[PDB]
Amino acid sequence: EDEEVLYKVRAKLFRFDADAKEWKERGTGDCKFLKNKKTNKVRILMRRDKTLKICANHIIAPEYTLKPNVGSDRSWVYACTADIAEGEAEAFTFAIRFGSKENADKFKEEFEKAQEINKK
Amino acid sequence: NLNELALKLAGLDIDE
Amino acid sequence: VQFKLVLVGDGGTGKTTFVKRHLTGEFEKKYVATLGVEVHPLVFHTNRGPIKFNVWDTAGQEKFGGLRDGYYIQAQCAIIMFDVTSRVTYKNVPNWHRDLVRVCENIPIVLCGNKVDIKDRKVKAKSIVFHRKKNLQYYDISAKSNYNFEKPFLWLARKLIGDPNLEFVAMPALAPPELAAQYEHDLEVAQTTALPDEDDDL
Amino acid sequence: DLDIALLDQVVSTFYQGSGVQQKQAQEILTKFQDNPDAWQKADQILQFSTNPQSKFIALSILDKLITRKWKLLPNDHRIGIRNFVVGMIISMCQDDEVFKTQKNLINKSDLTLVQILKQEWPQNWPEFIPELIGSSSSSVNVCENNMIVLKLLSEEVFDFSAEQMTQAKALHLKNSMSKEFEQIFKLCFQVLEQGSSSSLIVATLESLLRYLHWIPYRYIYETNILELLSTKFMTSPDTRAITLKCLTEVSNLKQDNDLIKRQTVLFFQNTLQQIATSVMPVTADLKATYANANGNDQSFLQDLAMFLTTYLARNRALLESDESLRELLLNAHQYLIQLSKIEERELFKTTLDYWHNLVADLFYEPLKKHIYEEICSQLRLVIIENMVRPTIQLYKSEREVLVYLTHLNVIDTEEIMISKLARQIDGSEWSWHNINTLSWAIGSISGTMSEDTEKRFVVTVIKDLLGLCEQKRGKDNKAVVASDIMYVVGQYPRFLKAHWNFLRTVILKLFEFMHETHEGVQDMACDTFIKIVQKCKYHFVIQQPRESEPFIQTIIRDIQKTTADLQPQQVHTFYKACGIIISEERSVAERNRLLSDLMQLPNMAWDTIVEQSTANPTLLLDSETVKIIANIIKTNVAVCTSMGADFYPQLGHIYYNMLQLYRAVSSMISAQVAAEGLIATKTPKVRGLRTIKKEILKLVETYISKARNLDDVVKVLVEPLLNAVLEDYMNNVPDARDAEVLNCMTTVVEKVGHMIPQGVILILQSVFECTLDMINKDFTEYPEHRVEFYKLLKVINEKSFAAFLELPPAAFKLFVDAICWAFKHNNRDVEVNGLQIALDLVKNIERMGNVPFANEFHKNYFFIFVSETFFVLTDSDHKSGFSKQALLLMKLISLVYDNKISVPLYQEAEVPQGTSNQVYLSQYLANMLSNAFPHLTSEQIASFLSALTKQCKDLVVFKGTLRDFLVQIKEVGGDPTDYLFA
Ligand SMILES: Nc1nc2c(ncn2[C@@H]2O[C@H](COP(=O)(O)OP(=O)(O)NP(=O)(O)O)[C@@H](O)[C@H]2O)c(=O)[nH]1
Ligand SMILES: [Mg+2]
């Protein structure tokens, strides 16, 4: 709570199992953009419903690129290099889906607005 | 007959 | 502070899928019959500290039964699982309970009816009564929609710790940290693969 | 041989270890257990080992040897293992350290002894029971463990025998224990009266609980055992829990004698006095006790609720006449009242089932309800405060009880609800949760008061509920109350029907709430609107006094501004609601024009689009145009849903263009599959196109399923539909075929299939062979086509069986393979459709008579069906369909023992001429079972088949013989005389 909530959205997060070519669910819950009041850096923290376990915890790096999935108008895919949700910051290729195309678009703007702030 | 009640509910509102 | 949990039930009811949902958040669509037993460590965070479950996911089918009732030794809590879309899995619940309370004869047990997400429900609510005289706690659960999927563990956690007011709480979030082209290869293959369950609400 | 010390480390790495080390010790401990001759080394582990877990695992290896290969052993192995086990148990009962710290091992040892008794007792062990009772006087530890032996024996013989042993074997054991019980009961009663070891007393009671599941009644009522359970053993918390379960089982036992009645009153009297003085008084708040969860309080409170309800539901009448028993009766019910306030839902369902039993009796039986006036008065508040949102099943039970209580006394129910409402207005009990539950209660008793009392009650509740909304600030607060008002007014239709001016105001208010952006309000407004329409349809279709037109015309004409800010799914509900009203108009021309006016907006949008899309089109690559089309069709589906046969004029306005749109959408899906591959079927653009096709099919299915003019269905509807959908299905790649096409054809065939024989032939030709190849490589791919495939074959086999006779012989052979393919599914819907099609098929062939087709069918496929049914019956992987398998098998067998198969089932070249089909059937079956189950003896197979065929006209007995066969194939050496059981 040493942060401020830039944006909050309901979403379901996927991780891609390379050695399988299948997507795997990782969590359903509230996805939040948290900007730290001390360092002004913004991050992704997403907790799963009821158990309240973290399934996404990484910095919105300005290097990351949001690209759509072949079979979804309401999803974004991006590669992540340092995620510490289970401990140990490892690289993942993530998909995130929302309830509508309106939210997936609104996510894409706030994700870019947070990417700017992150480098000042 | 009860138009006394109908006009109260016609006034039911959620905003303000 | 760890407790051993035996998970028993007929083959296909959802024991293995239910545990994978708590360890990785994954939902497995394929039925790979568990062989003997798979032991997994599961940890929850409560207002009374962390609690760890040594989950002994046992085998439903008899051909893969393994040790059978040998897996139950020194268990501290248990989950009996059945299929609300399969009458035969509920008919066998007294068989599973009979083997279980011959080895562990006063441990807290939860009875779970899985797959309430499926419309064509075959075991109606009013018919499920076996838990009443055997002092079992019952929950309608679904590993696919995550309906009541935390209730069985929260109940066992409250009995083994001894506080009826125990609750699950939020992990603290550590601050996140801040020659690669094989990442843009495995990326585009990820774009080529459609996300599963595109019709679901979320 | 065995390095026993190595074993004791394998087992310890398994139970107490972790990681890959435990996973490897796991897979080798299983390999040791399932070695077929590891039982020979159980000799050593049981006597040399220091680890009790190894002695447990070794007793597991013994149990599998005893249950399945006992009678194959040489005799002196059978007595070497017996004498051992008996000796090991005796050995562990004198060591007071092993008897108190190794309970798991002694119980597993007693179970293994009981497995031997099942095989050997009493025919080869007549001394067991008299010997077991002499040993009981030698040691308190042996007396207790012998109670564990007897408890486990009663369990395996009476409680878990029906599935595990043959009817003859179980009957033999039940008779054996019944003849020897007078001896067991003498010892059990002695231990209970002479004390004093608690661990011995509890083990005795836990075995008495098992006996009550059948022992005659004279052992309980004609001894002093009832006063012992109802007094001496209720005082100590060690024996209390199990004693309560025994008195619960006694309240269900096998009753005219006037003295058994006083004993049934007596033990109930003693039990609840002990509860009053030794546990807690009647006024204790059991809600807090249960919430604190101290010790076994929760388990005890659960057992008290089970004991009270069980006894009260059976013997309530024994306490209602005599006035000396009145305080006992109502005190027992006051405990139930206190138990009913415990917040634990599974327990609440237990007591609520009894309350239902009670208040039903008071509502029907005379001169009863005055006894329980104070009980019922409390029960009223208990349920009003725990009303759930309308589990769906728990609400119907809460409503049923509350409705009964309102009939028993309207006036008290009315004031509790008004008092609870006032305490909401003053704010002492105000909560979002508390105002919702109160509304659900006020809504549930609707229609039970008299019409004029209900009138005065509704206005009082609605009036005061309106002031609640005026007084609250904030939308979250006003939205909760506004929703509860609409729920209540929707729950009282009989009041709305008689006061049109008030009804007119509510609807205009729901229309107002539809422009509200707040969460859930629009969903509440639409749900309440259609809920009011179903119950007051008539008042919108007639010209209400002092207005100029039916209110439906007013609703229709400004439908665009009324639904202007709803979501499409909410708009579809609104149109479905108007369709309900329009169907009330029974003048055809007046109904058909209300239909025209209602469909005006979607008909206008439909017309442009067909226009500016035919001529083009490419417009259907537009994401937005596809959405506009789907919602136009969906709106038609909504209105057709509630109008049924009255929808036909609107269907014709769009039918031919809709089928053309269906064709055009079929092309573009095929185009983008060709341009981008199979992954195109997952893309949003193609998924929007498949939605148009699925929604078009749904509209046609919805109409035909409800059509009344069946001549119109055949004449104008079927033939343009078949041309549009069948060929497109047949010539698409399997990953673009819509399984809804099968479902549509099922609805068509089910209603008009008897009138379209050539149409059924063309349905089979286009979908049978190509869908069968989609689903005949595994049991997984295309679960939707799988289910719909066999729903279609089922109805075709029921309604147009001639279609299967016009199949080429190679295709008919594929039909039979698909029916047997369905047998082997574990998927429930596929498997029962499969067995049904087979059963419906042999009856279809039976009613053909003595004709070449019927004869050739029996020559080619009779034994295939006999053997495929025998396979799923005896493989333990399809036990959910045992009933349908047994019945299909019985029809197959009876066909031969009634000489309904005229041809010989064999080839003349393989058996003496003149041999009856019955004799060859017993030979084919005898050979088949011998190759499939080689460990069966020849006498087993002969006696089983002898019993099975002479019983092929008695299903219940037939099933018992199949069940006996399923037990004997799980072991070696079963007695063939078990099939003479009936
Ligand atoms: N619709 C639905 N399917 C479920 C649900 N839970 C599990 N399944 C499905 O049921 C099937 C059985 O999965 P599984 O977890 O292996 O059951 P099991 O009891 O562990 N089998 P076994 O006892 O032989 O090891 C899987 O295909 C799974 O997708 C559920 O909640 N809903
Ligand atoms: Mg499994």
Side-chain angles (χ1 to χ4, degrees), chain C residues 113-141:
Chain C
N114 199 4
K115 312 185 180 176
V116 309
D117 66 88
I118 286 165
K119 274 185 175 180
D120 203 347
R121 166 161 188 164
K122 294 296 203 164
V123 183
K124 290 312 294 134
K126 183 178 179 180
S127 169
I128 298 147
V129 294
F130 173 79
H131 59 291
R132 285 182 190 177
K133 295 213 243 252
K134 305 298 150 131
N135 290 120
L136 318 170
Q137 170 84 24
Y138 178 75
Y139 286 117
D140 271 3
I141 63 144

Side-chain angles (χ1 to χ4, degrees), chain D residues 147-170:
Chain D
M147 298 303 180
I148 303 192
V149 173
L150 288 173
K151 176 198 77 182
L152 290 174
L153 191 61
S154 179
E155 260 169 39
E156 300 294 319
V157 165
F158 293 91
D159 289 3
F160 310 103
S161 57
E163 309 184 33
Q164 303 222 77
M165 42 187 40
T166 61
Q167 318 180 87
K169 184 76 176 312

Side-chain angles (χ1 to χ4, degrees), chain A residues 60 66 107-117:
Chain A
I60 311 182
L66 292 182
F107 181 95
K108 197 191 77 61
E109 103 171 78
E110 318 256 352
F111 186 96
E112 264 183 312
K113 309 332 149 210
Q115 262 180 324
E116 301 311 319
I117 287 191

Side-chain angles (χ1 to χ4, degrees), chain A residues 1-20 22-87 89 91-120:
Chain A
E1 299 152 273
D2 40 301
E3 291 130 319
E4 179 76 45
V5 177
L6 301 182
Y7 178 53
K8 188 201 290 232
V9 74
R10 281 268 304 178
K12 155 194 276 183
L13 172 95
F14 296 83
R15 77 157 203 94
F16 189 86
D17 197 322
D19 322 84
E22 219 186 21
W23 284 101
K24 286 182 175 176
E25 287 192 50
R26 218 190 179 211
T28 305
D30 275 338
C31 185
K32 293 177 177 179
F33 291 104
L34 291 188
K35 178 177 64 189
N36 194 299
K37 292 162 185 167
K38 165 260 305 287
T39 170
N40 310 0
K41 297 164 47 202
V42 189
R43 68 156 154 185
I44 288 311
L45 187 86
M46 192 206 285
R47 299 179 174 280
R48 321 204 291 241
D49 281 342
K50 253 101 173 173
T51 60
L52 298 173
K53 285 181 183 175
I54 283 150
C55 56
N57 187 14
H58 59 251
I59 298 275
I60 311 182
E63 144 196 24
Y64 296 148
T65 325
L66 292 182
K67 297 158 299 213
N69 183 263
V70 52
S72 179
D73 51 318
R74 56 189 170 106
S75 298
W76 304 115
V77 191
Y78 62 88
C80 203
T81 37
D83 183 77
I84 48 156
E86 265 134 337
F92 288 99
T93 167
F94 277 144
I96 191 173
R97 186 166 52 198
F98 313 87
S100 46
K101 197 207 178 297
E102 71 185 51
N103 289 26
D105 282 336
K106 187 59 170 166
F107 181 95
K108 197 191 77 61
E109 103 171 78
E110 318 256 352
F111 186 96
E112 264 183 312
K113 309 332 149 210
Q115 262 180 324
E116 301 311 319
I117 287 191
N118 260 38
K119 293 179 179 179
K120 300 204 245 72

Side-chain angles (χ1 to χ4, degrees), chain D residues 123 448 470 809 910 956:
Chain D
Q123 66 278 0
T448 71
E470 269 156 300
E910 92 174 281
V956 153

Side-chain angles (χ1 to χ4, degrees), chain C residues 10-17 30-35 38 57-60:
Chain C
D10 276 13
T13 51
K15 303 190 295 287
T16 317
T17 295
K30 219 164 309 204
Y31 174 14
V32 174
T34 324
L35 298 117
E38 279 193 344
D57 173 11
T58 67

Side-chain angles (χ1 to χ4, degrees), chain D residues 810-829:
Chain D
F812 194 90
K813 200 257 170 180
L814 291 173
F815 178 52
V816 171
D817 305 339
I819 289 155
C820 295
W821 183 237
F823 289 5
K824 309 192 172 64
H825 284 81
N826 320 64
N827 191 342
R828 183 86 191 119
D829 186 294

